[PDB]
Structure formats: C-alpha cells, structure tokens
Amino acid sequence: DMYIERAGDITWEKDAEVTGNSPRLDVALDESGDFSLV
Amino acid sequence: ETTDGVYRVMTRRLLGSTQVGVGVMQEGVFHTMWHVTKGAALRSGEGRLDPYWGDVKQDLVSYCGPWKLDAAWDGLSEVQLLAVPPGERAKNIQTLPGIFKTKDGDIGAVALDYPAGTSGSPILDKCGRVIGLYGNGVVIKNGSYVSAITQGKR
Ligand SMILES: N=C(N)N[C@@H]1CCCCNC(=O)[C@H](CCCCN)NC(=O)[C@H](CCCCN)NC(=O)Cc2ccc(cc2)CNC(=O)CCCNC1=O
C-alpha cells in the first residue's frame, strides 16, 4: 500500500541554486513511454 | 489532506518506509508519473485516492479527477525543479531547459540528476505554475541524466 505525505508548497525560490546545462537531443518515445536517444 | 502542494509517495512493502516518488496536489487532484504508482490506489491519512486517468505512453496518472496542470515552458526562460529527494527536504533548483527533439515536436528537458524516488517532482515557471513533472528521460554519453519536462493535457 502506497500513501502520500505533504512535503511543501509549490513556489519559485528567488535564492535558488543554479546548475545543469541545456542539451539539444534527438529522441524517440516508444509505446512503453520510454525515451531513447536517436 | 487535499491541500495544494507537493507530496511524497511512500510505500511500506520494502524495508523501512521507502519513498517511491513525488506528486502534485492541485484543485483536489493528485498528479504523478505512471511509473511511480503503476496506477495503484493511494492512501492519504485515513482517506483513499483512486486513480482517475492515466496513460503509460505519457507516463502520467491523476487521482480523484482529471489532469489539472496545463502551464507549459515558454521556450526561453529558466525554470525551477522543486526536487523532493527521499529523506531530504524539498529544495528548488534553477536551470535553463534543453530540448528533446522528437518526430512529433519538441519538449523541454532539464539536465538534473536525482535519486529515482524523486520521480514526479514538479518543474515550475517563474509564476510558480507547474509546467510538468520530473523523471522520464534518458541517460547521456558520460552516464548522467536528462529528464523530459512531462506535461499532460487539461
Ligand atoms: N541513471 C541516472 N544517471 N539517474 C537515474 C535518475 C532517474 C530520476 C527518476 N526517474 C527514473 O527513475 C526513471 C524510471 C523509468 C521511467 C520509464 N518511462 N528512469 C529514467 O528516466 C531512465 C530512462 C532510461 C530509458 C532508456 N531507454 N532510466 C534509468 O536511469 C535507469 C538507470 C538506473 C540506474 C543507473 C543507470 C540507469 C546507474 N546509476 C545509479 O544507480 C545512480 C542512482 C540512480 N539514478 C537513477 O536511477
């Protein structure tokens, strides 16, 4: 049995840490809902 | 509890309590990714949440009503992943999305790598609207992760 418990409000944080790049990737989505690189 | 916000999805079928994912409560509907719950019913305190809509191909599922979240990335601005990792406090992480280019169009993606139980955490725009959920993506060359910004249709 799964259960849920609240973890926070959904709000933008002005002091947020920033990371991650922004790749452009060619992908395909199969009938299983899985992405694969093309 | 039906207050709007982000929620951990927990199970007891394994050792301890285990966070299997995350989801969003908005307008009395709970939103998560399909692979988190596989469509099973959820408990919320003494009340039960039954699935209402889902789609394996989108990897999405909603409980107690139809999918409510309809904001979308603007294609230009940074966003925040509100990551809720297992056993750790919710934390906002800002990033500029990349793009999944597919035969049927393009989809924002975020190059952020968190534990598997972080699946379903919301990605927000600068207005605080949920533009999609984290956790369905691909593993790139170096071995790290890029998640689609997965949004449903309201
Ligand atoms: N792997 C990285 N860097 N982070 C992932 C973060 C995943 C964030 C949450 N999303 C998922 O859990 C979903 C579930 C499936 C959705 C199906 N709709 N998962 C995927 O979206 C890819 C999509 C792949 C589709 C390809 N056709 N699947 C995986 O990563 C599986 C995988 C697990 C573990 C490793 C390597 C790969 C080894 N690393 C480690 O153990 C580090 C710690 C665990 N880290 C990780 O699990």
Author numbering:
A (entry chain A): 50 to 87
B (entry chain B): 17 to 170
From the study:
A series of cyclic active‐site‐directed inhibitors of the NS2B‐NS3 proteases from Zika (ZIKV), West Nile (WNV), and dengue‐4 (DENV4) viruses has been designed. The viral protease consists of the N‐terminal third of the nonstructural protein NS3 containing the catalytic triad composed of residues Ser135, His51, and Asp75. NS3 has to form a complex with its cofactor NS2B to achieve proteolytic activity. Due to their essential function in the processing of the viral polyprotein, they emerged as potential antiviral drug targets.
